[PDB]
Structure 1
Amino acid sequence: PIYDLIIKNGIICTASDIYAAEIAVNNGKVQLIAASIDPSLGSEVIDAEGAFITPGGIDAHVHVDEPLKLLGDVVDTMEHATRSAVAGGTTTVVAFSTQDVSKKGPSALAESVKLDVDEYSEQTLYCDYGLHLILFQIEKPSVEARELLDVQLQAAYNDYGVSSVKMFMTYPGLQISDYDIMSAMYATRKNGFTTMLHAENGDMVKWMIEALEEQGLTDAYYHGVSRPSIVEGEATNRAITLATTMDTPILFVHVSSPQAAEVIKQAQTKGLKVYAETCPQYALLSDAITRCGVGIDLSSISESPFTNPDDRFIGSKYICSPPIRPEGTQKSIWKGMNNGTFTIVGSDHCSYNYYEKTSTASKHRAFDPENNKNGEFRYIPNGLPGVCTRMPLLYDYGYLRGNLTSMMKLVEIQCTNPAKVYGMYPQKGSILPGVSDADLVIWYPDDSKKEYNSKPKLITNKLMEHNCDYTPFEGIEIKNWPRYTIVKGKIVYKEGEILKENADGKYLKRGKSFMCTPKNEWVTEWRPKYE
């Protein structure tokens, strides 16, 4: 035969089309779309049985255990995260490279990337992965700062194809001043890098945590209270102003505040290059889960404060940043996903155990009496596992339950826009013959009366195929799951089973995004020297 793989009787969904057609795959790539393909022409034939075929999901916000241990010890290696990704229909993940301050000179940031790539090259990878760079130490004064940083960015791009930079406006040790952000924007704009911001006002968070602790308000629920939506709103507004002054395209990660969505929308309406990412948990969960159809029925989730009232620390399972918001906020997230405010959807995947209390990668790391830590929300490692559930949750609660307008919108935000915004397009994100890596998901049929013993009814930890001991969505009904996950032409997941022999993931060098070229629009007559 001339093709490795033929997918028959399925319905292709892209970011702009839904139609019945067939796909031939060969040499790791999509080779052909036609009405019908002779099954004798392929080595293997998949009958999709009327089900949707989507491109593979691309999750550009995944945190894995890394050598510098910026987020302390995380339970998932790149092996575990990619295994979990694939079991949930995600076929490319992008994690984070931490700036190593012990390195200096022109190669300092390339060297930081090198630590991760070398660490993961020894692991079994189930799909491809790329890396963002995290920046938290910027040299001063500005004119030097912006100029040696330019040579460093070039080096990280040229050596390793890193084309995105992540910065924080919160967290002690990560938070940077506006002055430093401007210096970074100067460098990133010049190099066509994708600039990413975590926008929460760090000073406000800090002051409010101290005020709460002073009153002894330290339980998990007070994490949300310490940082209301207005704080994310202000920081996003400030970040947009900085972006505008610097004419730099900007992406906001894990947006969860209505105020932030408002200012983001205003900028987009003006035509400024402001992009945003949200996460399923911000659409599906409310802060009531932290103590005791549009959203998840919270009472159906198992092993939570509702089911286990005696366990006072179980709210830590749902502690993340920014926090899961109070009731009534979640509808504005779906609206933003539909109306164009959220360009992409990521998971903010960050895993810590709950059912073992002793390891450096536990939530119970918050209890360290000898280190003056007694379980206060401050000391709870922030994050939820979400890389596996991201796609199914959107399929079900988004498409099937009517909260997203169509499958085309689902594909756009989960697959195609992540590729475009992070320089993996067109290799990744669509179904383009002779161009696309054959990264594909075949779902189960929706209107069928046929029985599929392998199709899960509920989300369980075992289904996640990860290294964590819990999932926040444990016990909830899920109405579809990937039936096949195809990565670079090969079936790596089939009907509940991971096929390890077919794991062949590699580090991905990325290009410059075409979405992140500058508008060439300025507030004043000032222009950067290089213009």
Structure 2
Amino acid sequence: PLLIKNGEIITADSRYKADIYAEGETITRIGQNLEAPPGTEVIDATGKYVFPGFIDPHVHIYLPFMATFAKDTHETGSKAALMGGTTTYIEMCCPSRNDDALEGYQLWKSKAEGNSYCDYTFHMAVSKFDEKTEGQLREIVADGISSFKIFLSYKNFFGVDDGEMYQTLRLAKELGVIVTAHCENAELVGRLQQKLLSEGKTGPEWHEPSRPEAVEAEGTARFATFLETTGATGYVVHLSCKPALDAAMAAKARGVPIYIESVIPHFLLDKTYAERGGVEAMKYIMSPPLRDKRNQKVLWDALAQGFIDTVGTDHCPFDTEQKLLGKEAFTAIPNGIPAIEDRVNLLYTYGVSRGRLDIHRFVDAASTKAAKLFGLFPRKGTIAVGSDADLVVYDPQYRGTISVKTQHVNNDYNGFEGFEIDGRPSVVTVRGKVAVRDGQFVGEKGWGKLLRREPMYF
């Protein structure tokens, strides 16, 4: 049994002081001065906030990509997540066009079993479409995976054409599945990459120009048009700039059931980081690229007003050594930045503590909204009787800086090296069991379970 007392509870739509008692894995009751049976583990949350466990709807743990593999394992990844306050993560299951989808799903699925410290689930990538695949997708959905993922980029590896996208969306609508999508243009990026390389422009500073804002805007609008035409519900992952936001907003305004996600690096980093040259710049190469800083205000304002629904990380860790695989051509630099451990602290600091982000909008954008969209709610995403006891006792008096020297991500650099944070998790629990106590990791291996969802977007 667990009892968290004297803490100020804050959810997306409530704020109060009371005690939380969890007999087992779920919250049993809430009230003031609760009496917990003897033996109950008591946590004193005096002077601290008690938030629902945070949820990252977009991470990469196991990933064979751009000639190599992402650095975290479900073990190191889930641990880093917990240290950061994230108690549930949704990983992108990404088998390529040449892989068997069902086999890919089972591979990712088995790599996670007994290896995760916190709960998780997947987004099933659809990198090709045919009779064989349709049958396997029906099976994967039936196993509890209620979300797909398509890419409008990465030609021949992940990208699907209009015909495949259309079929994926019709199937999704039939199964009540929500489709997440990476929006760019596979053809344009490929052509622009070749053009720049043939011109001798090989440095990391040509990554952004090879896939400008106009391309993300085109893909975002195309995706919205297919959703509107098929009747399927969609979700745009890591939207990074105004032109794309305008396209997604226009779709929302005319009634298209589409949702928007932005990832932490696009709120705090900008294109100049990728113009520093050398391995230093390679550390900030991702897709969509970091943009002109003028976009940060746009994203922050949109987040405050709820135009942007969720905030994820698109966590994709690589070692500087791996980044150097593209010292000859920027097209060979493995795309990705690590952030699964810093999302919450960064969002809280620069959004709530030093920004205009309302604290309730913060909880909604970093936990509740994602739980709702992907069928994890009310099990996850909030604090209420019946919900899983995934809690985060947050300390707002803490002051420090982020550094690779103190991170738990299995790679050699931190994207936010030196950034200050005005808070951090003091205690983190997973289904009633303490995983982090006073900055000390005390999690239990294999405690995390796979969360199965029910389709709801017909």
TM bracket (short chain): over 0.9
CA distance in 2, matches of 1:475, 1:217: 31
Q: Does 1:165 align with 2:148?
A: yes
TM superposition score normalised by structure 2: 0.95
Deviation at 1:503, TM superposition (A): 5.9
1:29 to 26, 30, 34: 26
Secondary structure at 2:58 match in 1: coil
Secondary structure at 1:429 match in 2: coil
Q: Does 1:468 align with 2:411?
A: yes
1:176 to 149, 160, 168: 160
Structure 2: state its 5+ residue gaps.
none
1:385 to 333, 338, 359: 338
CA deviations on 1:487-507 (whole Å, 9 max, x unpaired) are: 111111122211134761122
Secondary structure at 1:288 match in 2: helix
The equivalent residue for 2:90 is: 94
CA distance in 1, matches of 2:281, 2:287: 14
- Taking the TM superposition and a 5 Å limit, the aligned residue runs for 1:33-48 are 33-38=30-35, 43-48=40-45
Deviation at 1:50, TM superposition (A): 2.2
- Taking the TM superposition and a 5 Å limit, the aligned residue runs for 1:2-401 are 4-38=1-35, 43-66=40-63, 72-99=68-95, 109-123=101-115, 125-139=116-130, 145=131, 150-158=134-142, 160-172=143-155, 173-292=157-276, 312-354=278-320, 357=321, 362-367=322-327, 374=328, 376-401=329-354
The equivalent residue for 1:421 is: 373
Secondary structure at 1:221 match in 2: helix
Secondary structure at 1:9 match in 2: strand
The equivalent residue for 1:371 is: none
The answer (yes or no) to whether the contact 2:127–2:159 under 8 Å persists in 1 is yes
The answer (yes or no) to whether the contact 1:316–1:363 under 8 Å persists in 2 is yes
CA distance in 1, matches of 2:225, 2:176: 19
Secondary structure at 1:329 match in 2: helix
Q: 1:69 to 1:238 in 2, by over 3 A?
A: closer
CA distance in 1, matches of 2:62, 2:179: 23
The equivalent residue for 1:300 is: none
Deviation at 1:86, TM superposition (A): 0.2
Aligned AA (2:369):
N
Higher strand residue share: 2
Moved more, 113-122 or 282-291: 113-122
Please tell me the root mean square deviation across aligned C-alpha atoms, in Å. Answer: 1.9
The answer (yes or no) to whether the contact 1:14–1:430 under 8 Å persists in 2 is yes
The answer (yes or no) to whether the contact 1:424–1:511 under 8 Å persists in 2 is no
The answer (yes or no) to whether the contact 1:256–1:282 under 8 Å persists in 2 is yes
Aligned AA (1:389):
D
Deviation at 1:199, TM superposition (A): 0.6
Secondary structure at 2:59 match in 1: coil
The answer (yes or no) to whether the contact 1:490–1:502 under 8 Å persists in 2 is no
CA deviations on 1:447-489 (whole Å, 9 max, x unpaired) are: xxxxxxxx45110124321211111101111110111111111
Structure 1: state its 5+ residue gaps.
140-144, 293-304, 306-311, 368-373, 447-454, 518-531
TM superposition score normalised by structure 1: 0.82
Q: 1:100 to 1:478 in 2, by over 3 A?
A: closer
Deviation at 1:347, TM superposition (A): 0.4
Secondary structure at 1:60 match in 2: strand
CA distance in 1, matches of 2:175, 2:74: 28
Aligned AA (1:438):
A
CA distance in 1, matches of 2:32, 2:114: 42
- Taking the TM superposition and a 5 Å limit, the aligned residue runs for 1:439-518 are 439-446=390-397, 455=398, 457-501=400-444, 504-512=447-455, 514=456, 516-517=457-458
CA distance in 1, matches of 2:247, 2:292: 20
The answer (yes or no) to whether the contact 1:319–1:382 under 8 Å persists in 2 is yes
Deviation at 1:239, TM superposition (A): 0.8
Moved more, 461-470 or 380-389: 461-470
CA distance in 1, matches of 2:385, 2:67: 40
CA distance in 1, matches of 2:279, 2:105: 36
Aligned AA (1:10):
G
Q: 1:493 to 1:192 in 2, by over 3 A?
A: same
CA distance in 1, matches of 2:310, 2:183: 16
Secondary structure at 1:119 match in 2: helix
Deviation at 1:327, TM superposition (A): 2.1
Deviation at 1:40, TM superposition (A): 5.9
When Rg is computed on C-alpha atoms for both structures, the one with the higher figure is 1
The answer (yes or no) to whether the contact 1:318–1:383 under 8 Å persists in 2 is yes
